[PDB]
């Protein structure tokens, strides 16, 4: 073999990525030898060659890339250059283009065939479905081919714009929500699309201290991992009672051990079941979803629907991993979502003003404090924002909460208060 | 004219299946028929079956063409991806499910499965969310695609049937930036370095902005070297996180004999039963050993099975640990506890632990 | 000759009641006869009676005279104090108990109570751990003995009757130095300032050590002037801890009209049923109101009572709250959440929340 | 009247500190009239008046005390001066004397009477019984009566030494333990005295970067608050089976709901009640004590006894209040207690070298890492030390743990090893 270490990963039940690389290699090489307009017949073959060496050396052969992009955007295109340009020229440049997925990754075939036509022609022929944030990854192309790729993207019957990268609003993503799922509390797909459209400018044109991410889940199951992998997690919820169908609950009872698998598992003890009637104390309910998850034919989320906003989530750098925390217990989610947008815009203005170079929203809030955070979004502190009140009495007070005294008087006249 | 910009994505609604478009937000119930096949019944009585398939995430455009030929023939031209990178076709005629499944395995070789059913409490393992590794990235400690292949071969049985008592997510990050939700996953594989960077003063002077390189180090192990217009690193303070190499190419810290993977456990995203939790390192380091990574795979396997073998229905790894405690965890899993596992990352605030990192609260 | 030193306190063993010496380390079972008297059988069946009595902590030497004289009767001339500052007594004759109670009642005037029994499960208020305050302390935001006397006036009936469902300790620190278990008690009173220091610049220039003062501030709020030689303070950064007043004479922050007490809640030191807990601030501020301190004392029962009523047997305050949540609590005790109570104390590290601050683990 | 505000607190059922002060007033002044040897018969009225101003003033009237020592010692005297110095001459110097209490706060009458003798003669007559750390407090005497009082204290038939203050070893304290508790896993009272004697030089003559507090509890009830108050809290425990007697446990069940009050209240579900048998699975027990508290007669702490050491306990300043955390899971408590001492000595060797001026042991451990702390004491890391493994991959590795490589040689080559 030319690639004996990668050949090993053609073995085993699980589909092989090595098979995907190779397949591209052969057929990009066939199309181009048989007359077709293919700019990079050897792209895929260079990358697998380089990937073989990386496996043999146990280290990357990529290096800090240079800035690059399409005319008009300052993000969406990651330059990557190989440190083996000499030996393997075809991978000397091998940039990625991040293409904006449709809401919830829903495709028709004509939409998919367009991208394949466009990528075969201007790039390596390899993709990711999908990038971790949500984007279609065009994986491998030279600087000369970027804009002409984009021009064809824009011109297809069903056209696809470039996603985000850099210190911009990144490509928002959603759970399937109401397209398939009966637990959905809002229209994930609609919101997500509308935020993408509303903030194309914030997305194509990096302006901020660092990157910002929004992800939308239709209920607390949170199937797009929003609280961990977006800065602004929009996780649907309800305020009123869980609707219960008793005929349906009884039919579970003939076979499912509800006592053990439902009643005992509720975090808050709020759901009773006696043999003939199910009783959720909704005042004690936390909307963890378990009881509905277990009993989807019988229990639905309640009628007063909306979303909890979760703030700050990020991977570790600089100050540690975050699972976002309660910023806004409940906000309405209804088109045109002016309520959500006013919180986003206020945050962005604030963060743009106060943020350090390469500081995340979550981190900024850790530095300036939640009161300032709350004043910015014009909302009030709420016990639901904390898992516990403070374990030390070192509280700041406002100058207006302060009682008139000789002291207060003596520090105004000192230039300090 | 002039090149079109700022038109964003094609509107999802133009690309949905007609039965999906009509029953949009009008669903009665779902029902997991069998591994990888979910029946969804609308209030209209329309039944649709969403059929799921494993993918390597890296796809050949020629494969995507194969998937399209297949969607046309079974699913009226429509398909979707999942948030864990599995692929899903829509079938109305239920006497067709098995033909699709068989045509998909045949032609592109992707296994139906990746599903689970809380109702019966029988769960499958789904795809591994992973990133670019040596395929594309310049800051990786490990390879994403090879570890994902070598792990999935071994746990294949668990992607195709519902052999687990609860949900288990396996996720993989090639370095500590994570590029995913690895930090909140029952089983996380996270590449790390164990060697501090050697400053290449000349590359630093040419290409690196110093103050921002310096402020990117979480331990304060970097200081500006004014008279040599470079960066001094204090080794006693460096924990090889890599951040400074993201920031500055003068500061590389790769070591093929010493870069490897952490194994972390007990992360949770959903609210079901118990609060979300970040993962916690339980194995400090395993070598890279391409193309199969046996040591790392051996420990992923040994962790999953100890959990599975002793777990109650619904009880995910962290909810397992919640019941039994860590002492019994390390015993049952047969891992070792060392001083590496005692948290010493100092810059993170106590007060973040007092915050409600979740949607669970009473009204 | 010439003044003997380093001889240490007396040997304890010599100063134990004779029944207590013989049966040292050899006892069968304890028992609580009534409010205040604990019976204790030996192993042989020697019966001793520890009879508890509240003291105002500070005492005249003539109050020490009187007790001794009381002791020389009922307790062979022997006695002890407790960790919460209660005087104890060792009557060997059971028919001689009740008499003793009055003798104390008449002379120095100390009540009988301060006990509690897990057996029946009827707990009651013990004494309040407090300290010198305005009597002898240069850094108090509140007075102890005063704010005590009042609390035990309104909650008197509690000391001398087992009516609480679970153990409750109330305690007080007179400033945030927090002398005593004020950081870990069931209901806590803490003296806090609310005003930044107006530095006496002419007092710093002579008395203080500036680098050790500046660095003593938790938030970097203090920076020096070189000119000048006088510390400056960023008001956008001081949360009025009063630590730099502990360091340096002329960093005063007493505002008579703004210094007051916060109310903490939820602390616990024992292991029983649940792991120890650091108290949590619930009322951000109440004023000094000499001499009866009505706001404070009212809120202490607008807190103790709401718990008292609602709690199960053995369920202390933090154990109550884990059951109901911080939502319910705040509504039930009639309290207000403000942003003041989102912890923002930046310097304490996350990693401490992952240490085992308890003796509770498995072998 | 002279003291309007302070007199209203002379009202009520709880014993008044005012009629403690006023008793000290009129009876010390009686001694002076009667012709008794009393150097400050003035100390207690002046103390009442100053406090009267402070009640009306709502602020203290004591200023920073300047270092006033007793010859030989640096620790033992907290000096305090009064800002109303000329207003009330008798309280110019109202210094406290911390006198080492005998462990367990046990006294014979003689001991107390001779103590009442000296403080009458050389002081104000006001005492604290007892101080928070445990010391008998002599509240307020002049600087010239410090040394004569300590002389008489070392000349009583029953002698009392000075206690601790300043950057030293403070006065170690102990719960009643074996003397009156049947829960005691060791002799708290004896290990208190021993340590108190062994390190007399450490207690009397401050040599550390800050204070250091030890306390001793006989069972996990922590009856002297040692894990919140002491840096090094000895909290008695056991390793084997909790001894159960099914007789008494029967007896209990006649009247005590064991199901709702014990079984179900145990934090790990180790203890069960059958109706006749009580089974404890010691493997899942955590020695929380609740089950021995609920059945004193019928349940005892196990045969194999010792203690758990908790490190770092301390009040707020600087970096936050601490509940001591697991340092040594089990150490045996055996006369002369050499193992306990080896740890402390090792700790102070380490803390005297590496500690900043005014730095509690807990903060330095945080600063230096547990590996170094365990290195010092010679203990391995134990899962029991933590409530969970770390939630980030950011581990330090030691030189000798790495595989030797080209890179490591490069490090050695530049002297970056
Ligand atoms: C298809 C997909 C959404 C999408 O747009 O891509 C999805 C869809 C459903 N999820 Fe999910 N979840 C999907 C990823 C997730 C993930 C997100 C992730 O893994 O990154 C989790 C959060 C991960 C975590 O908690 O760590 C997730 C946590 C849940 C919960 C949690 C179960 C639990 O025990 O905690 C429910 C409940 C359930 O098990 O039925 C749930 C249940 C469901 C239900 C059953 C709801 C319904 O009414 O249909 C949907 C069918 C899933 C099934 O297999 O039975 N879904 N769901 C997701 C694709 C995953 C895959 O291909 O394997
Ligand atoms: C393409 C993508 C990996 C993939 O194969 O899917 C990606 C790849 C890279 N990520 Fe990422 N990240 C990708 C999603 C994520 C996510 C999760 C998400 O978006 O769902 C995160 C965690 C959430 C977050 O951003 O906080 C993520 C967190 C990071 C971190 C920074 C986070 C932090 O700690 O502050 C690094 C470093 C940085 O950005 O400074 C990073 C940076 C990078 C760099 C630029 C490498 C570097 O060290 O400079 C990546 C380049 C790969 C290449 O050249 O081919 N990437 N990265 C992911 C997005 C494709 C898409 O648009 O769909
Ligand atoms: C008197 C005193 C001994 C001493 O001075 O050395 C003491 C004595 C006893 N304690 Fe205690 N405890 C004493 C401090 C404490 C305090 C510590 C403190 O407040 O500084 C508490 C820990 C406080 C905390 O957790 O915040 C304490 C934690 C316990 C535990 C309580 C567990 C719980 O949460 O309910 C048991 C309770 C029980 O026996 O039911 C206990 C039980 C006991 C027993 C019953 C044990 C026995 O068999 O003799 C002793 C009889 C007292 C009683 O009223 O029931 N003792 N005990 C203590 C001094 C305080 C006082 O004068 O009242
Ligand atoms: C004497 C005593 C009050 C009393 O009479 O009851 C006391 C009084 C003072 N303490 Fe304290 N502390 C007393 C026990 C405590 C305790 C509890 C203990 O040790 O058992 C603590 C918390 C536990 C700990 O720190 O380990 C305590 C934590 C403090 C604070 C905070 C220390 C820190 O870590 O930041 C300051 C520290 C300082 O000296 O700067 C302090 C310092 C002081 C000073 C020297 C005031 C100052 O800031 O200069 C006090 C002088 C007495 C006066 O007013 O003239 N005091 N102090 C307490 C000792 C009684 C006794 O010896 O029997
Ligand atoms: S987050 Fe909720 S609505 Fe969305 S796919 Fe998951 S269960 Fe369905
Ligand atoms: S949603 Fe969760 S907390 Fe609420 S009733 Fe269902 S299981 Fe209980
Ligand atoms: S996790 Fe690391 S190596 Fe992997 S793609 Fe992201 S930045 Fe690159
Ligand atoms: S590798 Fe990490 S800890 Fe080390 S110098 Fe760079 S940023 Fe700092
Ligand atoms: S808590 Fe403050 S006021 Fe009270 S004794 Fe300690 S230092 Fe003095
Ligand atoms: S009051 Fe506290 S925070 Fe403010 S300057 Fe003084 S030490 Fe710093
Ligand atoms: S700590 Fe334990 S041994 Fe000591 S007095 Fe309290 S219950 Fe008894
Ligand atoms: S001591 Fe506590 S944890 Fe152990 S068996 Fe008894 S109740 Fe359970
Ligand atoms: S990224």
Q: What are the DSSP calls for B289-337, one per residue?
A: -TTT-HHHHHHHHHHHHHHHHHPPTT--HHHHHHHHHHHHHHHHHT---
* CATH, domain C1-113, list 3.30.390.10, 3.40.50.2300, 3.30.70.3340, 3.90.1310.10: 3.30.70.3340
Sign for the pseudo-dihedral over CA of A202, A208, A211, A217: negative
**Chain B residue closest to C348 (CA)?**
B350
Asked, colleague to colleague, whether B1-113 and B195-253 share their fold, the answer is yes
Cα-based torsion angle of the residue sequence B185, B189, B195, B198 in order, rounded to the nearest 10 degrees? -80
Angle, helix A17-33 to helix B61-74, in steps of 10 degrees: 100
Backbone φ, ψ for residue B279 (5° rounding)? -60, 155
> What are the structure tokens assigned to C106, written together?
């008449």
Give A398's strand partners: none
Contact C281 A414 (CB under 8 A): no
> What are the structure tokens assigned to D380, written together?
């391995």
In this complex, the residue of C83, C135, C216 whose CB is nearest that of residue D224 is: C83
- Rounded to 5°, angle at Cα A366 from A362 and A368: 115
Residues 6+ apart with CB under 8 A from A46: A88, A89, A90, A91, A94
Task: Tell me whether the omega of the peptide bond preceding residue C228 falls within 30 degrees of 0, making it cis.
Answer: yes
List the one residue out of D37, D41, D85 whose CA is nearest residue D63. Answer: D85
Q: CA-to-CA distance for A189 and B11, rounded, in angstroms?
A: 9
Q: CA-to-CA distance for C143 and A187, rounded, in angstroms?
A: 58
Q: Is C62 touching B (CB cutoff 8 A)?
A: no
Alpha helices for D269-337 (secondary structure H): 290-293
Q: Give the DSSP H/E element, type plus range, for residue A24.
A: helix A17-33
What b/e sequence results for A290-327 when a residue is b if at least 16 CB atoms lie within 10 Å of its CB, and e otherwise? bbbbbbbbbbbbbeebbbbbbbbbbbbbbbbbbbbbbb
List the one residue out of D15, D80, D2 whose CA is nearest residue D43. Answer: D80
**Beta pairing class for D214-217 and D173-174:** parallel
* CATH, domain D62-163, list 3.30.70.2500, 3.40.50.740, 3.90.1200.10, 2.40.30.40: 3.30.70.2500
What resolution in angstrom units was achieved for this structure? 2.3
Written as one string, the DSSP assignment of C286-341 is EE--TTT-HHHHHHHHHHHHHHHHHPPTT--HHHHHHHHHHHHHHHHTT----GGG
- Rounded to 5°, angle at Cα C303 from C302 and C306: 85
The answer to whether D121 and D196 have CB atoms below 8 angstroms apart is no
**Beta pairing class for D243-244 and D325-331:** unpaired
List the one residue out of D133, D148, D378, D135 whose CA is nearest residue D231. Answer: D133
For residue A261, the 8-state DSSP code is I
Give the CATH fold of the C195-253 domain.
Alpha-Beta Plaits (3.30.70)
Backbone φ, ψ for residue C279 (5° rounding)? -45, 155
Give which of D316, D405, D407 to mutate to test A binding, by max A Cβ within 10 Å: D316
Q: Is the CB of C189 under 6 A from ligand 9?
A: no
> What are the structure tokens assigned to D395, written together?
């581990």
| Burial grade of C93 (CB within 10 A; 0-12, 13-18, 19 or more) | exposed
**Beta pairing class for D299-300 and D243-244:** antiparallel
C-alpha C283, offset from chain centre: 18
Residues 6+ apart with CB under 8 A from A401: none
At B230 the three-state DSSP class reads: strand
Backbone φ, ψ for residue C63 (5° rounding)? -80, -30
Q: CA-to-CA distance for B297 and B290, rounded, in angstroms?
A: 11
Q: Ligand 8: which residues within 6 Å by Cβ?
A: B 196-197, 216-217, 219, 221-222, 233, 238-244, 253
Taking the CA of A177 as reference, the closest ligand is: 5
Give A81's strand partners: A63, A93
| Burial grade of A400 (CB within 10 A; 0-12, 13-18, 19 or more) | exposed
> What are the structure tokens assigned to A332, written together?
């309405």
Q: Is the CB of D185 under 6 A from ligand 3?
A: no
Residues 6+ apart with CB under 8 A from C303: C187, C263, C265, C282, C283, C333, C335
The answer to whether A227 and B357 have CB atoms below 8 angstroms apart is yes
> What are the structure tokens assigned to A410, written together?
């003596």
Q: Is the CB of B132 under 6 A from ligand 7?
A: yes
Give which of A323, A391, A395 to mutate to test D binding, by max D Cβ within 10 Å: A391
Cα-atom radius of gyration of chain B, to the nearest Å?
Answer: 24
Q: What distances in angstroms separate CA A327 from CA A16, A330, A383, B170, C242, one per listed residue? A: 43, 9, 11, 29, 32
Alpha helices for D96-144 (secondary structure H): 109-122
**Beta pairing class for D173-174 and C86-91:** unpaired
Give which of C329, C351, C355, C363 to mutate to test B binding, by max B Cβ within 10 Å: C351
Distance from CA of B191 to the nearest CA of C (A): 22
Q: How far apart, in Å, do the first and last CA atoms of chain B sit?
A: 55
Q: CA-to-CA distance for D238 and C312, rounded, in angstroms?
A: 30
Asked, colleague to colleague, whether A1-61 and A164-237+306-417 share their fold, the answer is no
Angle, helix D109-122 to helix C61-74, in steps of 10 degrees: 160
How many other β-carbons are positioned within 10 Å of the β-carbon of residue D191?
25
List the one residue out of A79, A32, A101, A21 whose CA is nearest residue A54. Answer: A21
The answer to whether C104 and C110 have CB atoms below 8 angstroms apart is yes
Residues 6+ apart with CB under 8 A from D247: D298
At C133 the three-state DSSP class reads: helix
Q: CA-to-CA distance for B260 and A191, rounded, in angstroms?
A: 40
Tell me if the domain spanning D1-61 has CATH number 3.40.50.300.
Answer: no
Ligand 10, pocket-test mutation among C197, C235, C251, C347, most atoms within 8 A of CB: C197
Angle, helix B61-74 to helix B97-108, in steps of 10 degrees: 160
Q: CA-to-CA distance for B118 and B123, rounded, in angstroms?
A: 7
Q: Is B361 touching C (CB cutoff 8 A)?
A: yes
Residues in chain D: 417
Angle, helix C144-154 to helix C294-310, in steps of 10 degrees: 50
> What are the structure tokens assigned to D370, written together?
């547990």
The answer to whether B216 and A356 have CB atoms below 8 angstroms apart is no
Residues on chain B touching C343 (C-beta within 8 angstroms): 350-351, 354
For residue B362, the 8-state DSSP code is -
For residue C24, the 8-state DSSP code is T
Half-sphere exposure of B358 toward its Cβ, with a 13 Å CA cutoff? 25
Q: Give the DSSP H/E element, type plus range, for residue B132.
A: none
Backbone φ, ψ for residue D296 (5° rounding)? -60, -50
Cα-based torsion angle of the residue sequence D98, D100, D103, D108 in order, rounded to the nearest 10 degrees? -100
Q: CA-to-CA distance for B251 and B199, rounded, in angstroms?
A: 5
Q: CA-to-CA distance for D379 and D342, rounded, in angstroms?
A: 12
The residue ranges of every structural domain in chain A are: 1-61, 62-163, 164-237+306-417, 238-305
C-alpha D203, offset from chain centre: 13
Cα-based torsion angle of the residue sequence A280, A282, A284, A288 in order, rounded to the nearest 10 degrees? 80
Q: CA-to-CA distance for C254 and D59, rounded, in angstroms?
A: 7
Q: Give the DSSP H/E element, type plus range, for residue C170.
A: strand C170-173
| Burial grade of A371 (CB within 10 A; 0-12, 13-18, 19 or more) | middle
For residue B283, the 8-state DSSP code is E
Q: Is the CB of C244 under 6 A from ligand 10?
A: yes
CATH number of this structure's domain C114-194+254-363 = 3.30.413.10
Architecture of domain A164-237+306-417: 2-Layer Sandwich (3.30)
Architecture of domain A238-305: 2-Layer Sandwich (3.30)
Q: How far apart, in Å, do the first and last CA atoms of chain D sit?
A: 78
Number of H helices, E strands in chain B: 9, 14
Alpha helices for A37-79 (secondary structure H): 43-57
The residue ranges of every structural domain in chain C are: 1-113, 114-194+254-363, 195-253
Cα-atom radius of gyration of chain C, to the nearest Å?
Answer: 24
- Rounded to 5°, angle at Cα A87 from A83 and A93: 50
The annotation status of D116 as a binding-site residue, yes or no, is no
The answer to whether A3 and B39 have CB atoms below 8 angstroms apart is no
Written as one string, the DSSP assignment of B178-225 is -SSSTTSSSEEEEEE--SPPPP-HHHHHHH--HHHHHHT-TT--EEEE
């Amino acid at each position: 073999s030319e690639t004996p270490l990668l050949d090993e990963l053609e073995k085993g039940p699980w589909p092989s990525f090595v098979k995907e690389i190779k397949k591209t290699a052969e057929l990009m090489e066939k199309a181009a030898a048989e007359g077709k307009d293919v700019k990079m017949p050897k792209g895929a073959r260079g990358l697998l060659k380089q990937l073989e060496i990386s496996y043999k050396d146990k280290k990357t052969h990529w290096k800090h890339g240079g800035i690059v992009s399409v005319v008009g955007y300052g993000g969406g295109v990651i330059g990557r250059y190989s440190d083996l340009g000499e030996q393997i020229p075809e991978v000397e440049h091998f940039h990625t283009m991040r293409i904006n997925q449709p809401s919830g990754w829903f495709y028709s075939t004509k939409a998919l065939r367009g991208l394949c036509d466009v990528w075969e022609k201007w790039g390596s022929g390899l993709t990711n479905f999908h990038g971790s944030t949500g984007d279609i990854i065009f994986l491998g192309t030279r600087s000369e081919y970027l804009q002409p790729c984009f021009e064809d993207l824009g011109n297809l019957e069903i056209p696809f714009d470039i996603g985000g990268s850099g210190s911009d609003l990144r490509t928002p993503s959603a759970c399937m929500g109401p397209a398939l799922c009966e637990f959905a509390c809002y229209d994930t797909l609609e919101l997500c699309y509308d935020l993408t459209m509303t903030y194309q400018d914030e997305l194509h044109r990096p302006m901020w201290p660092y990157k910002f991410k929004i992800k939308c889940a239709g209920c607390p199951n949170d199937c797009v991992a929003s609280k961990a992998r977006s800065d602004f997690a929009i996780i649907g919820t309800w305020k009123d009672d869980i609707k219960v169908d008793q005929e349906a609950v009884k039919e579970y009872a003939s076979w499912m051990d509800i006592e053990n698998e439902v009643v005992k598992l509720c975090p808050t003890g709020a759901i009773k079941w006696d043999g003939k009637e199910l009783t959720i104390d909704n005042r004690e309910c936390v909307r963890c979803m378990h009881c509905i998850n277990k009993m989807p034919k019988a229990l639905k989320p309640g009628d007063e629907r909306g979303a909890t906003i979760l703030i700050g989530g990020k991977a570790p750098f600089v100050e540690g991993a975050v699972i976002g925390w309660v910023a806004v217990p409940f906000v309405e989610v209804e088109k045109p979502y002016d309520e959500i947008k006013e919180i986003l815009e206020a945050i962005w203005d604030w963060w743009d003003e106060e943020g350090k170079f390469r500081e995340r929203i979550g981190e900024l809030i850790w530095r300036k404090g939640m009161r300032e955070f709350l004043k910015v979004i014009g909302r009030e502190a709420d016990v639901r924002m904390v898992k516990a009140p403070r374990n030390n009495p070192f509280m700041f007070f406002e100058k207006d909460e302060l009682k008139p005294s000789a002291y207060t008087e003596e520090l105004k006249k000192r230039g300090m208060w | 004219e002039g090149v079109k910009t700022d038109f964003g994505p094609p509107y999802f609604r133009d690309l949905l299946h007609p039965v999906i478009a009509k029953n949009y937000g009008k669903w009665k119930y779902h029902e997991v028929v069998k591994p990888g096949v979910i029946k969804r019944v609308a209030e209209s009585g329309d039944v649709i079956y969403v059929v799921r398939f494993g993918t390597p995430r890296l796809l050949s455009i020629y494969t995507v063409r194969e998937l399209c030929d297949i969607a046309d023939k079974y699913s009226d031209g429509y398909l979707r991806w999942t948030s864990r990178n599995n692929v899903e076709f829509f079938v109305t005629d239920e006497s067709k499910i098995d033909d699709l499944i068989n045509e998909v395995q045949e032609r592109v070789g992707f296994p139906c499965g990746g599903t689970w059913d809380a109702v019966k409490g029988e769960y499958g393992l789904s795809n591994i969310v992973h990133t670019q590794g040596w395929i594309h990235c310049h800051t990786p400690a490990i390879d994403a695609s090879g570890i994902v292949k070598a792990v999935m071969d071994e746990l294949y049985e668990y992607f195709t049937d519902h052999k687990l008592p609860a949900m288990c997510r396996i996720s993989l990050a090639c370095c500590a930036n994570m590029c995913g939700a690895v930090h909140a996953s029952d089983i996380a594989i996270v590449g790390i370095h164990r060697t501090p960077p050697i400053p290449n003063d000349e590359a630093i002077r040419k290409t690196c902005e110093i103050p921002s390189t310096v402020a990117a180090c979480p331990t304060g192990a970097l200081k500006p070297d004014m008279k040599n217009k470079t960066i001094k690193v204090d080794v006693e303070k460096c924990m090889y996180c890599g951040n400074c190499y993201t920031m500055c190419p003068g500061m590389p810290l790769f070591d093929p004999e010493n870069d490897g993977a952490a194994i972390m456990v007990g992360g949770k995203l959903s609210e079901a039963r118990r609060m979300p939790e970040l993962s916690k390192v339980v194995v400090p380091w395993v070598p890279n050993e391409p193309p199969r990574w046996p040591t790392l795979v051996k420990y992923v396997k040994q962790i999953l099975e100890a959990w599975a073998a002793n777990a109650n229905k619904h009880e995910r790894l962290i909810e397992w640990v919640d019941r039994i405690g860590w002492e019994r965890f390390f015993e049952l899993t047969g891992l070792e506890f060392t001083q590496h596992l005692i948290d010493d990352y100092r810059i993170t605030p106590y007060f973040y632990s007092e915050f409600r990192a979740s949607t669970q609260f009473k009204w």
